[PDB]
From a paper:
Poliovirus (PV) is the causative agent of poliomyelitis, a highly infectious disease, which can cause paralysis and can be fatal. Empty capsids (ECs), which are also produced during infection, are antigenically indistinguishable from mature viral particles but do not contain viral genome and do not cleave VP022.
Data were collected as described in “Methods”. Data processing yielded a final set of 113,853 particles for PV2-SC6b and 147,409 particles for PV2-SC5a, and icosahedral reconstructions of 2.4 Å and 2.1 Å resolution, respectively. The quality of the cryo-EM electron potential maps is sufficient to resolve the stabilising mutations and confirm that they introduce no significant perturbations to the structure and do not impinge on the antigenic surface of the particle. For PV2-SC6b the mutation in subunit VP4 I57V (I57V in VP0) and for PV2-SC5a the mutation in subunit VP1 T41I, were in disordered regions of the map and were not modelled. Unexpectedly, in the PV2-SC6b structure reported here from bioreactor production an apparent disulphide bond is observed between residues Cys130 and Cys326 of the VP0 subunit (equivalent to Cys61 and Cys257, respectively, of the mature VP2 peptide). Whilst these cysteine residues are conserved across all types of PV, the bond between them has not been seen in any previously reported poliovirus structure and is not formed in either the bioreactor produced PV2-SC5a reported in this study, or in previously determined structures of PV2-SC6b from mammalian and insect cell expression.
Author numbering:
A (entry chain A), B (entry chain A), C (entry chain A): 70 to 97, 101 to 222, 225 to 301
D (entry chain C): 1 to 234
E (entry chain C), F (entry chain C): 1 to 60
G (entry chain B): 86 to 92, 99 to 111, 126 to 340
Amino acid sequence: RTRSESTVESFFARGACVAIIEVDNDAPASKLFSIWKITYKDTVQLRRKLEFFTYSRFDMELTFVVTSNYTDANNGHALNQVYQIMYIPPGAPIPGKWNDYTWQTSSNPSLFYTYGAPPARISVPYVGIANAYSHFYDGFAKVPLAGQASGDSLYGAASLNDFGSLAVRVVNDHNPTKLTSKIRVYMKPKHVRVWCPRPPRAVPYYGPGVDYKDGLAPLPEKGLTTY
Amino acid sequence: RTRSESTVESFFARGACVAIIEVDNDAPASKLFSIWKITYKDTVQLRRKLEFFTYSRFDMELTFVVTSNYTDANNGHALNQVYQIMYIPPGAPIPGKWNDYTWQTSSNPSLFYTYGAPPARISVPYVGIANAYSHFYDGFAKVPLAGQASGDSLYGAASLNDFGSLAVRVVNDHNPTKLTSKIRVYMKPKHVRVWCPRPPRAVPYYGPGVDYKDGLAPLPEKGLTTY
Amino acid sequence: RTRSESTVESFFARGACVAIIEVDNDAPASKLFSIWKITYKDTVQLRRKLEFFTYSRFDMELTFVVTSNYTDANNGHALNQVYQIMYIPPGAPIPGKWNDYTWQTSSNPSLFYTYGAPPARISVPYVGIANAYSHFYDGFAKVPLAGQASGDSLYGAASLNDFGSLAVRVVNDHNPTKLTSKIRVYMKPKHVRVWCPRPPRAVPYYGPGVDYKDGLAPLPEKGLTTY
Amino acid sequence: GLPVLNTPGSNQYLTADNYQSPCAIPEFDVTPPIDIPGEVRNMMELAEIDTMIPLNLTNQRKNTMDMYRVELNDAAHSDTPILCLSLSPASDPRLAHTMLGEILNYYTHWAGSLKFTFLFCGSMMATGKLLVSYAPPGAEAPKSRKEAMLGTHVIWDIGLQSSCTMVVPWISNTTYRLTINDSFTEGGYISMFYQTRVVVPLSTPRKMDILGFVSACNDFSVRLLRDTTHISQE
Amino acid sequence: GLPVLNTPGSNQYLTADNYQSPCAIPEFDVTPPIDIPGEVRNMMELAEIDTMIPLNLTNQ
Amino acid sequence: GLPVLNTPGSNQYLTADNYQSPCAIPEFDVTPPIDIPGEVRNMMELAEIDTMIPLNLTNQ
Amino acid sequence: TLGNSTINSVVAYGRWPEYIAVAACRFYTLDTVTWRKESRGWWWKLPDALKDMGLFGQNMFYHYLGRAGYTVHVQCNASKFHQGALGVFAVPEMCLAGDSTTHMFTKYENANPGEKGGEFKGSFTLDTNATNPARNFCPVDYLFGSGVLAGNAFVYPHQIINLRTNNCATLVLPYVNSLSIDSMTKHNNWGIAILPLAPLDFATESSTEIPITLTIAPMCCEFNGLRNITVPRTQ
Ligand SMILES: CCCCCCCCCCCCC/C=C/[C@H](O)[C@H](N)CO
Ligand SMILES: CCCCCCCCCCCCC/C=C/[C@H](O)[C@H](N)CO
Ligand SMILES: CCCCCCCCCCCCC/C=C/[C@H](O)[C@H](N)CO
């Protein structure tokens, strides 16, 4: 009996949903474009699996599953939509309107997806500025100095997990009818290395940190002398 | 004259329908998701072919043929649907709602199918916890013990044929119009080995066991001295 | 000048239409499934080409071109249809209803075609029970014996050209609107060998045999001493 | 990318195709096989096993054990047949539901020799000689021992041995026969007659039973897998 | 997978094409051929046979 | 181009598949790894560590 | 000879029993049954039939896991003026149909009768008592008790006792299972079915009865998982 399926590679060799980005195709209450900051902490399953360890390196595979629907019955028909997903690394200009110049994406990587096509997919290598990703950071970005007023940075927040965002829009000019679309993002780590195992999360997550608020009594009742 | 087409491989080298899973795409009398327990005993033809033998090993190929239709005439149009089929191995959490967290499928294998694409297809190896599958099990899961009240397990039922389930939903947000879909599951055993041939079933099947209730007089009348 | 295009292979290297099978997608005057007995004698061109010879061997390539249409204007829309074509070899149970168990096709070869896809195509080898196909059979299946009442089999009819049938249905559940579909079957013999050339048919075909009824005066008038 | 052209047949699902597909459970550690007794490699191996023939399918016998027993008695010699069978191993109702017939009903074409064994189940004090005959097809079915004697046949002495096997060798115009009732591929006739009568002493049962078994020989083969008519779902 | 580009002519059915297709009856044991008299390899072999000319195509 | 035939399973997304995809950041100069203590290769290595059992799961 | 017990043969699937206790595994004689003219057949389960046999039953109930092959010897003698035939079939995983509209409703105490075994019926009777269901097997002889034609039961390892020829049958059954070793109290590896293929007859006597005796020796026995004694519930 070998341990092939319990290797770290096999443990993480699954596409996990991390985001549902919602966009609308409508004439300018609607949202003609959406910005999603790239993280695995919006969901729980992949986060709990990753937080078995303190540090990690891996490449990432992103898959995009796109669904769409009409909002009103017999309101009319629509032609097949094209979606733009633009990666905005930290520092790049962020779109402020559906039609602003930033969508020209001369230097930003961009993906154009045609509805009805198989889910889109890209891969990226290990992009951390440190030698590994930090699942936990016990420190501050700024040390407050004597003389400073009431260096107030949040606990655990550091730019070592700042990877930019995804800006998503519908490229088509707006139909006479309103359409709603959702893009589901699935992450798969590849070529994984991990360090410093930790006990798994036992209570519900509360925020991007390790704070807990509710569900603090997980274990059930079981008699000591009862099998 | 060779016996190439009567080998055990050739005898089972066909995709046989084993299930018709029905789902609906409607606003929340409808069924927005369906759970099907994985078995070949919902149909008869493949079951009868397999029960020529007592034990078997093989890999399995699953093919999914998806069809859909509107429920009402001229009620409106719909955008192309995406279907999620998630394998839930025994012990994994079972979805209770269309939108519950379990669909994130961080560790469960999942398949996303786009309507109009060729039927979906996956393969799995021999996954039995024993050294072979048991088509027949002459025993109980629990032995009732003296002292126990009125170990009452069903005859022949054992966890050696428990392979989990398939949870099927439509990923798209619900259209203004009601849509109905059916997913037909086709099984093909591959690399088959079989042991202990048995006489074939002669009367209609009745339940997952060998019980019989009706049609107990299969043979017709034929004179002894009539060709 | 070589004779490459007059070889027997080149003479038959064309897909010839042999059948137009009509099916309907409607709620249960309609025909929700159709049975077509496999033969090349429903059409004339391929039959006349084949009947240049007495005996033949070849593999067969079948191509299926599927077309469909609405029956009423503005009656509504429909989702893309899936068609099942099941080969029923002689002796296999024949479907009697659109939804009967036979469509599970555990042992029958079956083909699922998605509308809008390129025409479907399969190949079969030489499947004759004799050493060659018989285009002509000068005999009976039964010899009537003295003592028998008024062995009455048809002249020329023998089971040496019995190859089963094709059962065709629409897999989708029935739309609110009526749809009509036609499947055109195109045959191409391959790796052809032929024996015993015959004079070509000169008058219109009448039935599966060599009988003639009409058009018995094919040749025109032409003066003997006129160029 | 690489220039490609989609040929006809693209995107079809043929249930008899043989293609690769992605594995849904990668890196699974499969349980190794053990040496289980009774492995089968070919369905013909099951057709080569003798199984009892339900010969006596009368109104009062069918769907009971009595349908397997053919009664002999010690009456005076006669030329009337004891049993008559058509050599249609998949469509004759008496052979269709044996193991051989059940295997044959999953295929369209069959060829090869057959083996018919008959077991005499009377007392040890019983004697008699029987004639077992195969007539190839084409003529009227034999209705007396005179006509049956002209075909292939064997003489069975029950006193000498209680079980006797007649091999029906493969004799056909076509290379294969159909597994349905078809005149062009008819098989012939199997018949049983009294060669002498059955003789018993006093204080002995005067009626006894014989049983019939059929199997395929090593030259048997089948073709064109198909669905059976022996199972249906409602 | 492998990067591919669909050229024009994709998804067409040309009745004169020569392509492979899947076998619908795998592992079929084909009946061997016998030596039948009168085999033909080329249709010109039939055109090289003398046949009678209907020369007198008058009304009667 | 090259004659091809799309088999069933084309255009599906299986979350357990293992396929190549295009790189969205080509020519990225990846930071090399360092020798961090406590590397893990197999989850069973974590299961081989003794952990305390909550044996006394009574109400109080 | 096996142990202190002493005395054609058929080796099931041509495989002699083999290892992957020693004294306990010997020939044991079950209770004799009476073959009558109207008898329909008998069945037993192995290792269930031997559960109260000396040290073998003790080892069965003291261990979690056990495996064994068997040697089954059927004994039935009559005169040269008797006629009749028995078929003795050894069936791996011999599941028998129940008697109720509920699937797989046969209770453990009825599925494991012991050395007495059970009898086949000529026809199927449906148990209708709903307040107190019988939850017993209803095995029909011509359906071989499992919905298959008895005429094809000859695909199983088998012997025929023809009264005019022989009076005994010997079947050597190796351990057959999807596992190398299993629980002997949860699972019966083998079933023995004896059906009258030809009815018993004796001249001018509609009263004749003859005994049939079964002697079974477990072989190549292995036990593992010694713990306290298992005491199954009885009815
Ligand atoms: C052109 C279409 C968009 C494709 C580009 C996708 C964005 C590029 C990847 C940025 C995200 C880096 C991977 C993230 C790693 C995890 O967050 C770390 N484990 C954090 O600790
Ligand atoms: C991600 C999409 C779903 C793909 C995963 C499919 C489920 C995995 C296979 C589970 C079923 C195992 C094969 C079953 C074997 C038969 O039931 C045995 N012969 C039972 O005796
Ligand atoms: C699974 C989809 C259906 C594919 C199977 C197609 C049917 C199999 C082929 C049967 C027909 C055999 C070829 C026929 C040959 C001609 O009829 C002979 N020349 C007759 O003389």
